[PDB]
Amino acid sequence: SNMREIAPKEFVLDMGAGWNLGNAMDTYNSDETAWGNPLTTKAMIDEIAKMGFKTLRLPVTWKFHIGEGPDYLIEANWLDKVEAIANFALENEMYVIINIHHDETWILPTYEKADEVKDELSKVWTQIANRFKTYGDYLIFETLNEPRHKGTPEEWKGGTQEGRDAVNQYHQVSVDAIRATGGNNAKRKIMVSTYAASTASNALNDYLVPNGDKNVIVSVHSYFPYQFCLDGTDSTWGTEADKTALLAELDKIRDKFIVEDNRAVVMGSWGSTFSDNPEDRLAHAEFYARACAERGICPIWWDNGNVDEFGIFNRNTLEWNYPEIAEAIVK
Amino acid sequence: SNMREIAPKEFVLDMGAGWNLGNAMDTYNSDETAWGNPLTTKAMIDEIAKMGFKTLRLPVTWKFHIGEGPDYLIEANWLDKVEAIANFALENEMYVIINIHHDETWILPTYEKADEVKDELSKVWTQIANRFKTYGDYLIFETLNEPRHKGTPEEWKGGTQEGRDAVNQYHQVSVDAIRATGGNNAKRKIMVSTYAASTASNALNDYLVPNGDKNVIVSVHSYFPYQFCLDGTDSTWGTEADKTALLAELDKIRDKFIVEDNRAVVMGSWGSTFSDNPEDRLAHAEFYARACAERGICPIWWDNGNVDEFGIFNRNTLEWNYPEIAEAIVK
Amino acid sequence: SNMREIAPKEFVLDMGAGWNLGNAMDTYNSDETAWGNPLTTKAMIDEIAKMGFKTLRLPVTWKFHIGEGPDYLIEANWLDKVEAIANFALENEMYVIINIHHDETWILPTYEKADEVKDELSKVWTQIANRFKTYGDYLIFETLNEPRHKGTPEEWKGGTQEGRDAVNQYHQVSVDAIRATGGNNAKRKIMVSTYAASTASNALNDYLVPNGDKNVIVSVHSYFPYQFCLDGTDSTWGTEADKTALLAELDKIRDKFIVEDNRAVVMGSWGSTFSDNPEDRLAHAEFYARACAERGICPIWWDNGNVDEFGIFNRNTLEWNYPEIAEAIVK
Ligand SMILES: OC[C@H]1O[C@@H](O[C@H]2[C@H](O)[C@@H](O)[C@H](O[C@H]3[C@H](O)[C@@H](O)[C@@H](O)O[C@@H]3CO)O[C@@H]2CO)[C@H](O)[C@@H](O)[C@@H]1O
Ligand SMILES: OC[C@H]1O[C@@H](O[C@H]2[C@H](O)[C@@H](O)[C@H](O[C@H]3[C@H](O)[C@@H](O)[C@@H](O)O[C@@H]3CO)O[C@@H]2CO)[C@H](O)[C@@H](O)[C@@H]1O
Ligand SMILES: OC[C@H]1O[C@@H](O[C@H]2[C@H](O)[C@@H](O)[C@H](O[C@H]3[C@H](O)[C@@H](O)[C@@H](O)O[C@@H]3CO)O[C@@H]2CO)[C@H](O)[C@@H](O)[C@@H]1O
Ligand SMILES: [Mg+2]
Ligand SMILES: [Mg+2]
Ligand SMILES: [Mg+2]
C-alpha cells in the first residue's frame, strides 16, 4: 500500500528485467486457456521470481468480460482472476504491470469513433483503477498495449496522422480516468504507448504524454530486428552489422525519449521466436538486454508459453525450456 | 601509416602501460619550459621506451598558440613541436596520445557559451586532425582532458546537469570534426572523457559516446584514493581496507564501461604525489597497475617532472628517480 | 587433541605421503556406495596406515545432506559418518584432511551468485568446523576441492578473471567462518586451493591466501602429464623428455609457492588412470613422489577404488591391487 517519492528514471532501473505472462489473460477468447496455456498459479510466478525477474507484465484482454454499455461493467469474477495473479507477483516482491491488451475491436482510432471509444475506455479504466486503488507503487498500469487501426496499410508503420491523434486522445482519457479515482492512483506509475507501441519516426514525433504527467513512463515494443524476431525469414544473429543496427534502434529510442524528452522507457515486449537457432537466440537476448541496461531501459521478454515460439518457461512442469535466455535477460 | 582491423578492447591491451609527459606542452604559459621542465628530446623518450612503457601520453595546452576568431588559427610552429615529440615516441614503437589539456578558459560548459565554444573547438580539432591525418593507428586523439566549469562547487564532484550536457556536446563536435577530415582519421581511435574525467556516479550516468562511434575509447582519471594521491592528507597505503576500496573503485569502472557498455577504458592519469613515503607509493603503484591490468584497463602514470611531486624520471640526467615505481607499473 | 607450535613447512613434511579415500563420501549420490565403493571400515584404513601412508584425505560431498535455506542444516548422521572415518585415521596416528568436494552445483563462481554462495558456504563451514572444534592438529580442513564454473570453456584452463575472483572470495568466507568458531579452529591448518586446484599460470597469479593467514597451506592438484594420467591418450611414460617436463611442472610449483611466497604445498590429488600400462604407471608414480619429497611437497594419490581406473587398494578384500605403486609412493 506504500507510495514512494521516486522519479520514473529511478523507478524503471528498480524494475530490473521483466517477463510477460503472454497468451493467458490476454487470450482472445472468453476462456483464457484457449490459446494453450493453463490457468496461472502462484507456483509458476514463484519460478519467474526465483530466476531473477523483478517485473511481471500481466497483459489482459477485457473484451469478453465487459458487459453492455452504457455502464460497460467488467465482470467482478474476471477482475478477481486478474487480482489474484497480480498478488502472486507482489508477494514475490515483484513489480506487476496490468494493461488493456487485444481490445482493438472496440478501441478504433478514428475521429468518427473517438467519442464512443473515449466514453467506454473512461468507464473501463475507472473500474480497473478502482479495483486496484489501494495497492502500492509496485503495481503499474499500462493504458493501451498496441493501440492501432487493425487491417489498415499503416497498422504496423506508425499509423496515419488521424490514427496517432486518436491514440493520444485515448491515452489522455485513460490517464485522466485513472488519476480521477484518487488515492494511490493520483501518483501511480502509468505506462503510455506510442501508436501500436511502434518506434517508427512518425509514431515517435507525434507521441504526447497526457498532461505532461510526471508519473508517466514511455512504453514501446521493438522486436528488433523483425526478420529474426517475428517473421522467421532470418534465423542468424550476431554479425557486426546485426549489433550495429540494434544499437542504432535503441539509440534512437534513448535520444528521443530519455535525452531530449527526459522520460523513462519500459520496453514492455521484445524477444525472438524459435527458428532452430538456439545459439543465435541466446546471443541476441544477451546483447539486447545488456544494451537496454546500458541505456536505463527496462526490458520485458515476450513469452507466449509455446516452446516452439516465444516460450522459455514451461508452465505445466515449472521447468525452464531455455534457462540460458532467462539468465541472459536478467543479468 | 598503417591502420589495423582492431577492436578497442584489444587495442587497449596492446597499449600496455603508459607514462605522461606532464608539465611540458600542457604548461599554462606561452613558454613550455615555464613549469620547470626542459624542451623534450628523443633521448628522454628513448628512456621511457627502454624502461618498458608502451604508451606515451603527450598532453598539450593550445591556448597560447591559437589566433583570434573567426579562424582561430593554430601556430604552425606549435604544431611542429607537438609533431616532433609524437615522432620521438612513434619511432620507439610506442603509442602516442595527443589531447586538448589546460584549455578550460575557452571551453566553458554552459548553455550560454555552447555555440561559441563548439565553433572554436570544431575549428581547433579540424586543424590538429589535418596535421596528423597521415599517421597510423599508434597515434591516438583525446578530445578533452578534464572538461569542466572551473571555480564551481561541483567542478570536482561530476559537474551540474548543465555541465555534463555541454561536455557531451563538446565531445560530439570534436569527434565529428576529426572524423570529417577523413583519411586515417575516419578510423583512428579517439579517447572521450566523462565530465572532468570523473568517475563519480553522475558523470558515469550522463556519459555519451558521440554517434555510438565504435572507435571511441573511454577516458577517465582516478587518483584513488585522493587523500593519498593528491592532497597529501594521508601518506599511508597498504591496509586491507585500502586495497578493498581501490578494487571497488576499479570494479565500478569495469562494471559500467567494460561489462555493461562494451567499451574499452584508458586510465589516462593516475598516480601519487611524494609524501616522504616511498614504501607506500611503491605498494600503491604495484597494486593499482596490477588491478588495471587484470581488468583490461590501460594505466598511464602522471609524471610532472618534479621529483618532490609526481616525477619518477629525471628529464635532465635521463636517470630514473624512482625506477621501482616505473618497474611496478610496467609489470 | 593438542595444537603444536609448528610452521606449515614442517607440518607438511610431517604429513609424509597420503592416500585418498576417493569415490566414497565424495560420491555424487545420496548413497555413498553408489559409485562402487563399500561403506568404509577401520580395517580398510588400518591397511592404508600399515602400508606406510601417513595422511588420509577424506573427500566429502555435502550436497545431498544439506537442508534448505536459510539454515542449510547438515544432517547430523552424515557428520557422524565423516567423524567416524576421521577417527579411523587419527587412531592410526595419521593426519586426516576433510573437505568440500563435488559441491560445485551450489558453489557457482560468478559475481551474480556470490552473495547467495558466500552465505551458504559460511553456514556450512561453520557447522563442519563446530563439529570438529575439539580435534587436535592432525585434523586438517580443506575449504574447497576444485572450485570452478562447470561447463564453461575455461573450467579446466584456470577459469575466467571473474571465476578466479569469486573463488578467492569463497575461500575468504570459508577461512573466516572456520577461524570465527575459535578453539583449536583458530590455529588449525587449512588447505586453500587455486581455481580448480589448477597449476596454470593464470590460476597461480591470482591466488590469494585469506588474510595472509599464516596457518593456510596451498592446495594444488596436478595429474601431470594429463595425457597419460587422465585422458588415456598416451600410455607411455619414462623418456628423458617425460622426466624433464614433470620436474619442470613441480619446479614451477615450488618457485611460485615455496620460494617466492614462503608457503607450504600439499599435492592433494595426483596419479594415473590405468591404461594397460603397469610398468609405466609404476615408473611415473616412483618418479613423481620422489620429486615431490625432494621439494618438500606432500603427495596424496587419488584412489577411486576401481582397479581399472585409479584403484590401487582393494577395499573388499583388504589386499593391494598394485602394492608396487603404493610402496613407491611412500618410500
Ligand atoms: O497459438 C495460440 C494462438 O496464438 C495466437 O497468436 C498470438 C501469438 O501466440 C502471440 O505470441 C502474440 O503475442 C503478441 C502480443 O500479444 C503483442 O502484444 C505484441 O507484443 O507482439 C506479440 C508477438 O506477435 O499474439 C498473437 C495474437 O495476436 C493466434 O492468433 C491464434 O490463432 C492461436 O490459436
Ligand atoms: O610547479 C609547476 C606549476 O605547477 C602547476 O601545477 C600543476 C601540477 O604540477 C601538475 O602535477 C598537475 O597535473 C594535473 C594534470 O594537469 C591534470 O590533467 C590531472 O591529471 O591532474 C594532475 C594532478 O593534479 O597540474 C597542475 C596544473 O593545474 C601550478 O599550477 C603552477 O602554479 C606551478 O608553477
Ligand atoms: O565410478 C563410476 C562413477 O564415477 C564417476 O566419475 C568419478 C571418477 O571415478 C573419479 O575417479 C573422479 O575423481 C576425480 C576427483 O573427484 C577430483 O577431485 C580430482 O582430483 O580429479 C579426479 C580424477 O578425475 O571423479 C569422477 C566424478 O567427477 C562418474 O562421474 C559417474 O558417472 C560414475 O558412475
Ligand atoms: Mg541473420
Ligand atoms: Mg592511509
Ligand atoms: Mg608417453
Could you tell me the CA-to-CA distances from A42 to A34, A39, C59 in Å, in that order? 20, 10, 40
Query: Are C312 and C268 a contacting pair, CB within 8 Å?
Result: no
H helices then E strands: how many in chain A? Answer: 10, 8
Q: Per this entry, what is the length of chain A?
A: 331
If you take atom 1 of ligand 2, which residue's CA is the nearest one?
Answer: B35
From the list B160, B144, B49, B136, the residue with the least C-alpha distance to B94 is B49
B217: phi then psi, degrees, rounded to nearest 5 = -105, 145
CB-CB under 8 Å, B208 with A293: no
Distance of CA B34 to the CA centre of its chain: 21
Q: How many Å lie between the centroid of ligand 2 and the Cα of residue A85?
A: 62
Separation of alpha carbons A258 and A275, rounded Å? 33
- B&C contacts, CB < 8 Å: 4
Separation of alpha carbons A170 and A111, rounded Å? 11
> Rounded to a whole number, what is the distance in Å from the CA of A58 to chain B's nearest CA?
28
Contacts B295 to C, Cβ<8 Å: 161
Query: Are B267 and B17 a contacting pair, CB within 8 Å?
Result: no
B276 touches chain A (CB under 8 A): no
Residues 6+ positions from C330 with CB-CB distance below 8 Å: C16, C17, C51, C52, C53, C54, C289
From the list C57, C65, C72, the residue with the least C-alpha distance to C30 is C65
- A&B contacts, CB < 8 Å: 11
Query: Are C249 and C292 a contacting pair, CB within 8 Å?
Result: no
On the CB side of A229, how many CA atoms lie within 13 Å of its CA?
18
Q: Catalogue all structural domains in chain B, each as residue range(s) with its CATH number.
A: 1-331 (3.20.20.80)
Name the residue facing A247 among B208, B212, B260 (closest C-beta): B212
C206 touches chain B (CB under 8 A): yes
Partners of C66 in the β-ladder: C74
Residues 6+ positions from C224 with CB-CB distance below 8 Å: C245, C246, C249, C250, C270, C288
From the list C260, C266, C92, the residue with the least C-alpha distance to C192 is C266
Cα angle at B279 between B277 and B282, to 5 degrees?
A: 105
State which ligand 1 atom lies nearest to the alpha carbon of A34: 34
Q: Per this entry, what is the length of chain B?
A: 331
**Helix (H) / strand (E) containing A329:** helix A323-330
Partners of A97 in the β-ladder: A57, A140
Determine the residue of chain A that is closest to B213 in CA distance.
A244
Contacting partners of chain B (3+ CB pairs under 8 A):
A, C
**Helix (H) / strand (E) containing B265:** strand B265-270
**Ligand 2 close to Cβ of residue B142 (< 6 A):** no
Among the residues of B76-160, which ranges form H helices? 76-90, 114-131
Contacts C211 to B, Cβ<8 Å: 240
Among the residues of A92-239, which ranges form H helices? 111-131, 161-180, 201-205, 226
> For ligand 5, a single-atom ion, which residues have Cβ within 5 Å?
B 234, 236
For the residues of A241-261, what is the DSSP string, one character each? HHHHHHHHHHHHHIIIIIIIT
Tell me the resolution in Å.
2.2
Contacts B261 to A, Cβ<8 Å: 294
Residue B242 annotated in ligand binding: yes
A34 touches chain B (CB under 8 A): no
Could you tell me the CA-to-CA distances from A11 to A270, A326, B208, C28 in Å, in that order? 20, 22, 22, 44
Could you tell me the CA-to-CA distances from C247 to A118, B227, B313, C223, C250 in Å, in that order? 85, 49, 42, 13, 5
Cα maximum dimension of chain A: 56
3-state secondary structure of B37: coil
A248 touches chain B (CB under 8 A): yes
A317, exposed or middle or buried, with CB in 10 Å at 0-12, 13-18, 19+? exposed
A116 touches chain B (CB under 8 A): no
C-alpha cell at A32: 483464457
Contacts B240 to C, Cβ<8 Å: 211
**Extended beta strands in chain A, E state:** 18-20, 55-58, 95-99, 139-142, 190-193, 216-221, 265-270, 298-301
Contacting partners of chain A (3+ CB pairs under 8 A):
B
For the residues of C224-281, what is the DSSP string, one character each? SSHHHHTS-S-----SHHHHHHHHHHHHHHIIIIIIIS---EEEEEE-----S-HHHH
Contacts C161 to B, Cβ<8 Å: 294-295
C161 touches chain B (CB under 8 A): yes
Residues 6+ positions from A320 with CB-CB distance below 8 Å: A47, A51, A312, A313, A314, A326
**Ligand 2 close to Cβ of residue B310 (< 6 A):** yes
On the CB side of A289, how many CA atoms lie within 13 Å of its CA?
24
Query: Are B328 and B14 a contacting pair, CB within 8 Å?
Result: no
Q: How many Å lie between the centroid of ligand 4 and the Cα of residue A237?
A: 4
Partners of A46 in the β-ladder: none
Determine the residue of chain C that is closest to B295 in CA distance.
C161
> Rounded to a whole number, what is the distance in Å from the CA of B206 to chain A's nearest CA?
9
Among the residues of B132-158, which ranges form H helices? none
Among the residues of chain C, which ranges form H helices? 8-14, 42-51, 76-91, 114-131, 161-180, 201-205, 226-229, 240-253, 278-294, 323-330
Could you tell me the CA-to-CA distances from C62 to B107, B248, B249, C120, C194 in Å, in that order? 63, 33, 37, 12, 20
State which ligand 3 atom lies nearest to the alpha carbon of C310: 11
**Pair type for strands B216-221 and C298-301:** unpaired
B331 touches chain A (CB under 8 A): no
